[PDB]
Each structure stands twice: as structure tokens, then as C-alpha cells.
Amino acid sequence: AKDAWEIPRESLRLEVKLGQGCFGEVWMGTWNGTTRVAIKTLKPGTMSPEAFLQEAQVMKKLRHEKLVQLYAVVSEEPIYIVMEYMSKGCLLDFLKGEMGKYLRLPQLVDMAAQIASGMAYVERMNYVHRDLRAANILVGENLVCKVADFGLARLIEFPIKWTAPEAALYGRFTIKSDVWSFGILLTELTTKGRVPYPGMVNREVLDQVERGYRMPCPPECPESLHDLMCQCWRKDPEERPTFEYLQAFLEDYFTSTEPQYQPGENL
Ligand SMILES: */C=C/C(=O)Nc1cccc(-c2c[nH]c3ncnc(OC)c23)c1
């Protein structure tokens, strides 16, 4: 028995590869002959069909302007998850590539504010994302940024570099472990997409972060924004800020917190 998200596969056409998802290719396509969509597919043997479809099931419950929106599901093999098309690709590639070279702090903080707004919704809905990072943010026209890849997201009831230590070690995933990941994402934004903890392997990251080590202020990043990162990286997850606070802080940043900001060479 199917629900009202289900469509027939013949209503989809797949034009062009957009890249590799976690478990199969993602394609740009059209739906019902007039809607541009993205279509996540499942590579054979990677994982079971319904484990793949848990991603679609979580997106059925989520609807916000800063989260990539589910459109439709084909729940018979070959499975397709059909969703909103984001024309500028993943944020990580955007930051690393030609276009991000001219991004400066006002645009980067505005992207962080949009991401914080989507995560504030996740927060209000009592969900956790667990895979928050620049590779899982998608960019659209006018530099809209949206939270994507809900493959691990879940109603509240792993790469150590982005994952809060209590989640990596003990599996304690809460919205505060996502707040930690958002702090790491802020470093990806202010370094034009560099890998966090440069020159450290995972085991060193784990040992050091447990000893109190935190990344220093990126070059030309204001101390006030590095302070925000350090708050997101507090050892005690309950001392980390809420996404509601991060959204407001970042939206108001250049009036309330850095009214004297001056452009630099890179930020
Ligand atoms: C950061 C690299 C990366 O993950 N790129 C990437 C892979 C697969 C798909 C996409 C992509 C691009 N536009 C999209 N719109 C909607 N959904 C997507 O994937 C789910 C999109 C980028």
C-alpha cells in the first residue's frame, strides 16, 4: 500500500548526472514533462531498498525553505527519491572552486545564516541531522543555501572531524551534536572549503579534541566569529548555543556584532 508521495516511474526522465550520492548516482531530470528535479538513485548491492528509503521517509515530515524539499518517491526497484533541484551544486565545491574565490565575509555569513535557519527548523521539529557539513549543503540561484542529505537524519527518540566527540564515541546524537558540526562548517566557510584540522589524521583529532584542543581563528576571520565557533565546540553539549541563537546572531552580525567590519584580501 503506497502513500500520496508515490509517483509512477514513467513520469520521470533522467537527463544528466549531477554527481555521486552516498549510495548511488544523483541525476538532474524532469518530472511530468515540465518540472526540473533532482533524482537520487540506489546502486545495486550497496544497501537494502527500504534502508535507502528511510531517507525519503524522513523528508516526508520536513518542509522548510532552507531544507531541500522532497517532491515524490518511486518505492519499487529501481528506487528514486525525487527532490528540488539546486542549480549551483554542493557548497563545498562552490567554496573550493572558481566562484567562491571572490566570496567575502558578508556573503559567507549570509550563507551560514541561511543554514542556521534550516537547522533551527530541524531543531524546532525535534530532529537531528547527524551529517551537517559543507558537502551536504546545496546552493541555488541568488546563493540560496539549503540543508541537504537527510540519509542519517532522525526524530529524536562517523567522521570525527565533523562529529561532536560524544556522538562519535558514545553515539549520543542530539541537536547539540549538530551544533558542533555547524561550528566546523563555519570553518569550512571561512577557509574556502579546506578540510578541518589540517594535517591531523582522525585518531589525532579524537585525542586532541578530547584534550581540549580546538581549531584556532582562521586568517582574517573576526575573533567574534571564532568565538561563536568555540561556543559550538563546548565540551558539554548543553552549553552549546541553540540554532535559534545562531540564526539570530548571524542574521544581525554586521549591525550588532561587527559594525566596524572592513573587507580584507580574502574575507
Ligand atoms: C559536494 C559534492 C557533491 O556532493 N555534489 C553533488 C552530488 C550529487 C548531487 C548534487 C546535486 C546538485 N544539485 C542538486 N540538487 C538537488 N539534489 C542534489 O543532490 C541530492 C543535487 C551534488
Author numbering: 256 to 412, 424 to 533
Give verbatim excerpts from the published study on this entry.
Acquired resistance to these targeted drugs is caused by a secondary mutation in EGFR (T790M) at the gatekeeper position that occurs in 60% of the patients, inducing steric hindrance to the first generation inhibitors and thereby preventing inhibitor binding. Herein, we present covalent inhibitors of the drug resistant gatekeeper mutant EGFR-L858R/T790M based on the pyrrolopyrimidine scaffold.
Using the established synthetic procedures, compound 14 was transformed into the desired unfunctionalized compound 9.
